Symmetry: D2
Subunit: 127 residues, 4 copies
């Protein structure tokens, strides 16, 4: 349904700026919000919960063993309810033409927004 | 530079939504702010200030006699100041490469917007 | 589904620029591509077929009678199939909150695009 | 007009994606197109050119001395000719409303686009 590799790209991109602890904090929020139990993550009742849940989650992301793949696959729901819509969209655009068009439209829009800034800049220099 | 017929085109477009009186009241206020004396307009003095200015201005726009042309040209400054920016961009694109590109880019941003809708609905196919 | 009145909103809006002949022609093509038989529409095996059923379709849109109403619902599929996505979203917005939100976001993008032009105008 | 500290922010931002070699490769090209001579930049008929121009350029970016500042100022024309437009607009927005209103309008445009994505996803 969604290749582990591509779940990895979106996961690394989500953690690109503020580190891995943000996506982990969010995913874990959702996870417990959804009443999940698989894979197992530590709740706030545990000493360094976040740091530990962060290492567990990203270890699975990086590994490629059938085990890893199964745990992240079970985590997709918490991921999808947590991850930035745009990233979720990019993650699914590999296995879906719909999401692929959604990301392509948005990108076409951002380019045009920037072509506007460009034409607006030159032209201002032309006083 | 700006041809009399380009001004007409934008003038009628402005007038279309709510009638010629909105553009007239708008151009008047701007007219009396720049302290213009030519062409002659009517002060908020006259009982039928608006209505009489409306008749006079669009009668010039609608005609192609050198006198109607001359008066709309002198009125251009007040028009540019009160006229909706998009209509101004459009009015000036026939005379300027910059505004052509500027308007062309918004048309492109708007098609993108509609492409988004197209995709969001092209999805009702699957549910 | 979609109230008859709303279809009339999008149907007229769709005929405002190029005329009646375009919507009618689009609908007819979608109609035959869907292999539809009700309501009755004239194929190319007729003389001025396009002019003949451009009359029927809009004769149904303008009325509110049970027969006009039923024949339009029957045509919806060909209408949703050929109508421009934007007009379709407007159409279904009166009944769907999802489609209403979709249309609102489209308006904001457009407004933001107009704000761009103004800013560059302000810099004159 | 443009404060050295603000040129540094945009320069570093332009550098973060693929490193400092990109800006320098780009600024260098514009430098020679405009036919500039100050400060000194090594042309292609030089072995380690790019590597040398990169160290030179970001060395002035890092500092706040009169020498570094006047050299980046002299370079501004080549910077503006090559730097991503949105970066150039951000850079000169600290001192101009026009460029600030531009940045801001672009941000909304992207937020509302991301808004559409979120909405369209929630949908199908």
């Amino acid at each position: 349904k969604i290749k582990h590799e591509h779940i990895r790209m979106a996961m690394n991109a989500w953690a690109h700026p503020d580190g891995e602890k943000v996506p982990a904090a969010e995913i874990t929020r959702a996870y417990f919000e959804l009443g999940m139990t698989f894979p197992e993550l530590y709740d706030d009742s545990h000493p360094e919960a976040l740091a530990r849940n962060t290492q567990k989650i990203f270890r699975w992301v990086e590994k490629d063993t059938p085990d890893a793949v199964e745990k992240i696959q079970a985590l997709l729901p918490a991921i999808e309810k947590s991850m930035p819509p745009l990233l979720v969209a990019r993650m699914r655009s590999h296995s879906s033409a719909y999401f692929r068009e959604l990301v392509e439209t948005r990108e076409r829009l951002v380019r045009d927004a920037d072509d506007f800034v460009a034409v607006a800049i030159a032209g201002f220099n032309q006083m």
